[PDB]
């Protein structure tokens, strides 16, 4: 039972008996497992087709963009500083991979991260710039987040980090399943705190479906070169590919535009279907 | 005939003469924790028959204007006998369920109800300027549950929001079309065929055991697929009965007293 061909079709003749495959009861919740041979006459044919690439592994074997991170490299005195940028890791900033993942309730998988970096000038020539090097540091929850592009935190004694040189092939790393529970949960119908009757109101309030305050942490990105007289702007694009994935409890797909991290929906976008007629082909 | 059934749990028992069948969600029966999958090390508590018994909720009336009903578990049973006491005296808990919906009519009535059991049944709020902002009190109505609506009306009191849901019926309350909800465990009550539905729900979660006061594992939704009408306004009652199964509690503390209003 691995990439094997689907079952063959048999031959059937006329039927005259007290057996009624076509009559069933949808009320019971089960689906009638019929085949064409149970209702029409058929010829024998050898089957060759297989379901090898509708599987869960092949359905998630695509790298999908999830974020774009922007940093600058210019004299700090200018109106816009040498902007190191902070991004909190999530897949809900985009809709495609989010929609694909939310076909299910729980899942386990390893992740593959790919980074593509591009840069460009913003003013008319006025010289050039030497090749730039970027640092991408992972800041797990509880660690100190950088507050300046040249802080002590960038020593990365224990934090993982990647140094990337412009013009080279994209960077890539892998990470295991890092959940504190036995599987990730795409939905959580609950709260993180209970408001107690004997306690003041403000002390028990919480967001709906928040679960852990922040699951996985932060990515910090900067240019390592000091500065150039000319401003240079660069962007980093993050791509995700789940590996060795498992899933449970399928769900209906999203039918309307997303609105925030939750299942909420916005007014004026609740009419997905279009016009048709009952007796029109 | 195959339409007759009898079920007994503890000192409770049920008999039916016009049942379609019983559905077990995902074909799994409720069970206790195995030694190879138990995270906490303390000795659990199993009240057994003292809590594993059928409880009857308040009945509701089905008319032409009804849009639907929904409940949450274990929230709906928070005030039921010793089950609620064990829920509030302990930090951790888990259990399965047996849900039985009862609705009968004469041979001259018509209509249909769709009964769905959904794990992690998130619902959409009413605010259009904030997200995930509904309050605990409104999100847990108890044994009275809530109702679906046919239209979306966003709240506009930005300085004093109501902080409550607004589930549209055809979007199933969560942005997904109703017609696709049959992917969840379900059973249809068609008045011409059967007059009851029974569902067996095992414990489903990403954790072996969790807090019962903060998190709801299952949700129950009943919506009319075909409107009710009768020779002619028509009205018939729907009553709901639920029994915890294989319930287990851990982490005994002093009792919790949540703010319910």
């Amino acid at each position: 039972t691995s990439r094997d061909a689907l079952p063959n079709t048999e031959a059937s003749g006329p039927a005259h008996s007290k057996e009624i495959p076509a009559l069933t009861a949808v009320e019971t919740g089960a689906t009638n497992p019929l085949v064409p041979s149970d209702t029409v006459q058929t010829r024998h044919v050898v089957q060759h087709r297989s379901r090898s690439e509708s599987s869960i592994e092949s359905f998630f074997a695509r790298g999908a963009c999830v974020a774009i991170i922007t940093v600058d490299n210019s004299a700090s005195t200018k109106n816009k500083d040498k902007l190191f940028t902070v991004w909190k890791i999530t897949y809900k900033d985009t809709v495609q991979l989010r929609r694909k993942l939310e076909f299910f309730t729980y899942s386990r998988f390893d992740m593959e991260f790919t980074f593509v970096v591009t840069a460009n000038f913003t003013e008319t020539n006025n010289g050039h710039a030497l090749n730039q090097v970027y640092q991408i540091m992972y800041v797990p929850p509880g660690a100190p987040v950088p507050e300046k592009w040249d802080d002590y935190t960038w020593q990365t004694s224990s934090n993982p980090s990647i140094f990337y040189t412009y013009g080279t092939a994209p960077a890539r790393i892998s990470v295991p399943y890092v959940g504190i529970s036995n599987a990730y949960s795409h939905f959580y119908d609950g709260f993180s705190k209970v408001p107690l009757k004997d306690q003041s109101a403000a002390l028990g309030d919480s967001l709906y479906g928040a679960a852990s305050l922040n699951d996985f942490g932060i990515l910090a990105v900067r240019v390592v070169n000091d500065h150039n007289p000319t401003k240079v702007t660069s962007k980093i694009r993050v791509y995700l590919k789940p590996k060795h994935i498992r899933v449970w409890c399928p769900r209906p797909p999203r039918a309307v535009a997303y609105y925030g991290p939750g299942v909420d929906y916005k007014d004026g976008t609740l009419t997905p279907l279009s016009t048709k007629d009952l007796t029109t082909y | 005939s195959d339409r007759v059934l009898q079920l007994t749990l503890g000192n409770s028992t049920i008999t039916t003469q016009e049942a379609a069948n019983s559905v077990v969600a995902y074909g799994r029966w409720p069970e206790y924790l195995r030694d190879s999958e138990a995270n906490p090390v303390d000795q659990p508590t199993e009240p057994d028959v003292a809590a594993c018994r059928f409880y009857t909720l308040d009945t509701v009336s089905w008319t032409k204007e009804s849009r639907g009903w929904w409940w949450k578990l274990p929230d709906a049973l928070r005030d039921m006998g010793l089950f609620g006491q064990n829920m509030y005296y302990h930090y951790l808990g888990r259990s399965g369920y047996t849900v039985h919906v009862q609705c009968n009519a004469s041979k001259f009535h018509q209509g249909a109800l769709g009964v769905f059991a959904v794990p992690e049944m998130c619902l959409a709020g009413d605010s259009n300027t904030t997200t995930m902002h509904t309050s605990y009190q409104n999100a847990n109505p108890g044994e009275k549950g809530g109702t679906f609506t046919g239209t979306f009306t966003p709240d506009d009191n930005q300085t004093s929001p109501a902080r409550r849901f607004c589930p549209v019926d055809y979007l199933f309350g969560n942005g997904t079309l109703l017609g696709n909800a049959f992917v969840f465990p379900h059973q249809i009550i068609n008045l011409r065929t059967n007059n009851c539905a029974t569902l067996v729900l095992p414990y489903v979660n990403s954790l072996s055991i969790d807090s019962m006061v903060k998190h709801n594992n299952w949700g129950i939704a009943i919506l009319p697929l075909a409107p009710l009408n009768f020779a002619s306004s028509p009205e018939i009652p729907i009553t709901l009965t639920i029994a915890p199964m294989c319930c287990e509690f851990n982490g005994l503390r002093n009792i919790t007293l949540p703010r319910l209003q």
Partner: antibody, heavy 127, light 107 residues
């Protein structure tokens, strides 16, 4: 340099209500906590309230507690302050400021250092 | 709550002088204090944080010190454009609070 612009200030009769707004630009609004600080004419600074970038958790100083309300709209990148029962002692210039608490909803991991300030809007309680 | 007391309320000095300003706390707050500068008709500007760290872009003639209940801001050599009001601000715990402010003027 980010941009913070306040508006809504003006003359208000005693005992009435007023609403202030602060529009933010040049940065990701929904990842920072925002503050209100006021300065009476010729006096020192005075802190009012904070909100921890989620729209739900907040804190008020004892001067305006009970009367003032702070809320935000992350989709429009705007901050609001609703004032009720205004007294003659509430006359001051109101500033909206941004601290370094980025992904934080608790005092434990916040740190209140104000990097940016707005131009300020004047509120006068007189008749 | 914590009360911040600043002294002197105002002072005068000649260009090139060494000026010192003190902010005092009603209880020990480790090193949770900031300093701000506010020129007439403008919003405050951050000078020091953590009671010793100099904000980027600030002239090196500003420096902060102290710990516990006593803190100090000093200007090594006063310049014409330093005339402004100076505030101290603590963040030991909520609610936050500022000092009374100190005016600096040329003699």
């Amino acid at each position: 340099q980010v941009q913070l612009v306040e508006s809504g200030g003006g003359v208000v009769q005693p005992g009435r209500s007023l609403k202030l707004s602060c529009a933010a630009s040049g940065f990701t609004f929904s990842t920072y906590a925002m503050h209100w600080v006021r300065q009476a004419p010729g006096k020192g600074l005075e802190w009012v309230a904070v909100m921890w970038n989620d729209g739900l958790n907040k804190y008020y100083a004892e001067s305006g507690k009970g009367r003032f309300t702070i809320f935000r709209d992350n989709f429009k990148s705007t901050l609001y302050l609703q004032m009720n029962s205004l007294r003659a002692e509430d006359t001051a210039v109101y500033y909206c400021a941004r601290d370094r608490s980025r992904y934080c909803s608790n005092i434990s991991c916040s740190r209140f250092i104000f990097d940016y300030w707005g131009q300020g809007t004047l509120v006068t309680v007189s008749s | 709550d914590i009360q911040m007391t600043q002294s002197p309320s105002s002072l005068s000095a000649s260009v090139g002088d060494r000026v010192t300003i003190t902010c005092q706390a009603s209880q020990d707050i480790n090193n949770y204090l900031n300093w701000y500068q506010q020129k007439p008709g403008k919003a405050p500007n951050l000078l020091i944080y953590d009671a010793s760290n100099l904000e980027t872009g600030v002239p090196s003639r500003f420096s902060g010190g102290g710990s516990g209940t006593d803190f100090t801001l000093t200007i090594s050599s006063l310049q014409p454009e330093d005339v402004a009001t100076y505030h101290c601000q603590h963040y030991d715990n909520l609610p936050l609070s500022f000092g009374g402010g100190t005016k600096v003027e040329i003699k």
